[PDB]
């Protein structure tokens, strides 16, 4: 049930200075990156071309080499259009791609944030402002929608190219997408008093961590957030309040796909 995400982040500091950087994710694995300094898009995975031929890829990259330069000048020209209404510094963020579902069905999106607020999306055959968006955007929208050729292409990329590509990505990357990596747990404590159960290096993300006295799951166990490691595995911790002296006989228990049913039991 994997989501393919292109994340464009563009900064516009003043009239002249601008940079645009993207990353691409399939699920929670990075497949591409494209740094403002690079003329071309980089693969972060051996399979990042999916099942596209070299022709199909070059053509796709070229589509984008031109979009990057063009997007930039268009935002600049729109700032000229609104001013002094709106002004630099400006941050535009794009989130685009498609979610793939059982078998054939899919759903594409293209969402735009301005100054970190979601305001615009491509939907159907045109750009439209979403709810809560400021009315002034109605001018940029009307101008963007005048560009018939940009619209036709965006429709083609959302409707056809994106799911086609992702269909092929999932095939090329099954091996990495389905990798199983065992977590490793350790315990530690701090004053307030508070026990910690560190679980690190597991993949994929779904995991279970509860403190326990025997077979008794503790009420107050607090799951922290999933933190990433640099080698594409996950880190999580779980904390539990205790009166000093009560540490005796407490276990951290970890369930996870990689372990094939041998839960990690760590006593204190």
């Amino acid at each position, epitope marked *: 049930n994997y989501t393919f995400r292109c994340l464009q982040m563009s900064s516009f500091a003043n009239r002249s200075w601008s940079r645009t950087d993207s990353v691409v994710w399939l699920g929670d694995l990075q497949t591409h990156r494209w740094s403002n300094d690079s003329a071309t898009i980089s693969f972060t995975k051996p399979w990042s071309q999916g099942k596209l031929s070299n022709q199909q890829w070059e053509k796709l990259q070229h589509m984008f080499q031109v979009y990057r330069v063009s997007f930039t000048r268009d935002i600049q020209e729109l700032v000229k259009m609104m001013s002094p209404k709106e002004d630099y510094p400006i941050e535009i963020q794009l989130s685009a791609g498609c979610e793939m579902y059982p078998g054939n069905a899919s759903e594409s999106f293209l969402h735009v944030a301005f100054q970190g607020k979601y305001v615009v999306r491509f939907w159907g055959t045109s750009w439209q402002t979403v709810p809560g968006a400021p009315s002034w955007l109605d001018l940029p929208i009307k101008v963007l929608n*005048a560009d018939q050729g940009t619209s036709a292409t965006v429709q083609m990329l959302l409707n056809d190219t994106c799911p086609l590509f992702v269909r092929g990505l999932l095939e090329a990357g099954k091996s990495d997408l389905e990798k199983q990596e065992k977590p490793v747990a350790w315990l530690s404590s701090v004053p307030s008093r508070q026990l910690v159960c560190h679980v690190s290096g597991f993949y994929p993300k779904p995991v279970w961590v509860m403190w326990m006295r025997g077979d008794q799951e503790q009420q107050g166990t607090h799951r922290g957030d999933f933190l990433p490691n640099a080698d594409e595995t996950w880190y999580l911790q779980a904390t539990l309040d205790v009166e000093a002296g009560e540490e005796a006989g407490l276990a951290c228990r970890v369930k996870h796909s990689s372990l094939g049913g041998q839960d990690i039991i760590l006593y204190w």
Partner: T-cell receptor
């Protein structure tokens, strides 16, 4: 989709203030000024996206722009020089890609 | 100088056909427009080509555009005296007012009556 320029032809001395005017009734938000010199294609000097705004084009040096209103776009040369001898076209457009051109104004600046 | 026209000038006898060429490196190339400009006058639009491989016509004028070759030609069938004019190629880099027009320097046609 009509555009007028005034004057249509001007003789001016070095150091003179010259004003070239453009008017359009189409309610077009967008106006543009260009000069045409043989052996070159048209070149953009200044443009405007609406009343009270102007923007530098590719060759702005020696020209000021004035957009007092929706109808009017003016090219002002404060200190005219012989090098501004040319034919000047004004243009207008809505959001779409077409620019509708004026009939052009010929200028000669003498010493 | 991203829009080159050829030939720079030509002389034809009334009744003859001619082909004018335009070659560009503008990016992107949304559309291409041919203007006709009579000596001492304004720019009259003959045709605008917008598709990847495109063909248009307007009386004795016809034109082609190939966006891969970044090439356009303009054909005048059975020239007449009033075709004496400068013919100007123009490329527009957006499908909207966000664009800039890139003008060729033109081709000068003289028709011997």
């Amino acid at each position: 989709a009509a555009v007028t320029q005034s004057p249509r032809n001007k003789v001016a001395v070095t150091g003179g203030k010259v004003t070239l005017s453009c008017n359009q009734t189409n309610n077009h938000n967008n106006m543009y000024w260009y000069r045409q010199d043989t052996g070159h294609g048209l070149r953009l000097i200044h443009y405007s996206y609406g009343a009270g705004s102007t923007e530098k084009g590719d060759i702005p040096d020696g020209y000021k722009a004035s957009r007092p209103s929706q109808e009017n776009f003016s090219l002002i040369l404060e200190l005219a020089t012989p090098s501004q001898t040319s034919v000047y076209f004004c243009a207008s457009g809505d959001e779409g890609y077409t620019q509708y051109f004026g009939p052009g104004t010929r200028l000669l600046v003498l010493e | 100088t991203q829009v080159e026209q050829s030939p720079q000038s030509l002389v034809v006898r009334q009744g003859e056909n001619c082909v004018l060429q335009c070659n560009y490196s503008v990016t992107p190339d949304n559309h291409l427009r041919w203007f006709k400009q009579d000596t001492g006058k304004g720019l009259v639009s003959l045709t605008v080509l917008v598709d990847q491989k495109d063909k248009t016509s307007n009386g004795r004028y016809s034109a082609t555009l190939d966006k891969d070759a970044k090439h356009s030609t303009l054909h005048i069938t059975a020239t007449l005296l009033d075709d004496t004019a400068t013919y100007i190629c123009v490329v527009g880099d957006r499908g909207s007012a966000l664009g800039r027009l890139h003008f060729g320097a033109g081709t000068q046609l003289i028709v011997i009556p």
